[PDB]
Amino acid sequence: KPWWEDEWEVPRETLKLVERLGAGQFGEVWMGYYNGHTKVAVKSLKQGSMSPDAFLAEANLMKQLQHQRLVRLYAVVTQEPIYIITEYMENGSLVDFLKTPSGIKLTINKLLDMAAQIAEGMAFIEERNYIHRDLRAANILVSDTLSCKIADFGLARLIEDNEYTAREGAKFPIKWTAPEAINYGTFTIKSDVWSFGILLTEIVTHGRIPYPGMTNPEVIQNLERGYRMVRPDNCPEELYQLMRLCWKERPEDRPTFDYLRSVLEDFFTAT
Numbered sequence: 001k002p003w004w005e006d007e008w009e010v011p012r013e014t015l016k017l018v019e020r021l022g023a024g025q026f027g028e029v030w031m032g033y034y035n036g037h038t039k040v041a042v043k044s045l046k047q048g049s050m051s052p053d054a055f056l057a058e059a060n061l062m063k064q065l066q067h068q069r070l071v072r073l074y075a076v077v078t079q080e081p082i083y084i085i086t087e088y089m090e091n092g093s094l095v096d097f098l099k100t101p102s103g104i105k106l107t108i109n110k111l112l113d114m115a116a117q118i119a120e121g122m123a124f125i126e127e128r129n130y131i132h133r134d135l136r137a138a139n140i141l142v143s144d145t146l147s148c149k150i151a152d153f154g155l156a157r158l159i160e161d162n163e164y165t166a167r168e169g170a171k172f173p174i175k176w177t178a179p180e181a182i183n184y185g186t187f188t189i190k191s192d193v194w195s196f197g198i199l200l201t202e203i204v205t206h207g208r209i210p211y212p213g214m215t216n217p218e219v220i221q222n223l224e225r226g227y228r229m230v231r232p233d234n235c236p237e238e239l240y241q242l243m244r245l246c247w248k249e250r251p252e253d254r255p256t257f258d259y260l261r262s263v264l265e266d267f268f269t270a271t
């Protein structure tokens, strides 16, 4: 729909940017208020840094993916500078939160709780025939009530047929990305499952970088041998064995996201 007819389009006057949370190559991220009272997060596009159409594609995708466990699109300003306005998450990135004084005091119980909420969000995505492709602690946001939500749908895709294949020159974070997606550029919901496995190590290690003390080539090489990530410190063996299902050699052998939720809910209540 055209902006003058789009229900997500708002006048720019309704927004007040209060505090800059981040700045990068492609724009900024602010905490602000909509109509005076409603805390929102504003992502503004740096005019010229990238394509307005490419920028907005993230918003259009969020129109299709609405759920309590996914960070919600709030509105767009489609005149330059382009704004994407979203649900505000008071506790920010999971990778950052786990490192704060509060984050540090969480029981393994609450950690499993959180892990279950993420998998619940991914189950909705799995069921809607989407993939995320960028799943990792840095892209999970945390509310003021210590609940978690999927974020960053920049690379997220709808799957008409089974697979989305990226460019041959396309490059992805090597520690989080499934072998097939690194090697062949082929992504499926199953390659998100692999990332989920890695994310579990970030949760239990409180946001430490995966594969401690290993370069990418060493990581790619260990995997090809049949090795997986060394048991993280203080990791329940149950959770570790769950990570392992996520890291199965064949995509189709990796569990569903609905299975992972249900399993993580059993771990959680049993503690």
Ligand SMILES: COc1ccc2c(c1)c(-c1cc3nccnc3[nH]1)cn2C
Residues within 6 Å of the ligand: 021, 022, 029, 041, 071, 086, 087, 088, 089, 090, 091, 092, 093, 096, 141
């Ligand atoms: C740059 O990363 C940060 C650092 C601190 C932060 C943030 C992001 C956020 C935050 C970023 C963010 N982005 C979208 C929707 N909700 C959000 N909440 C809140 N705090 C307190």
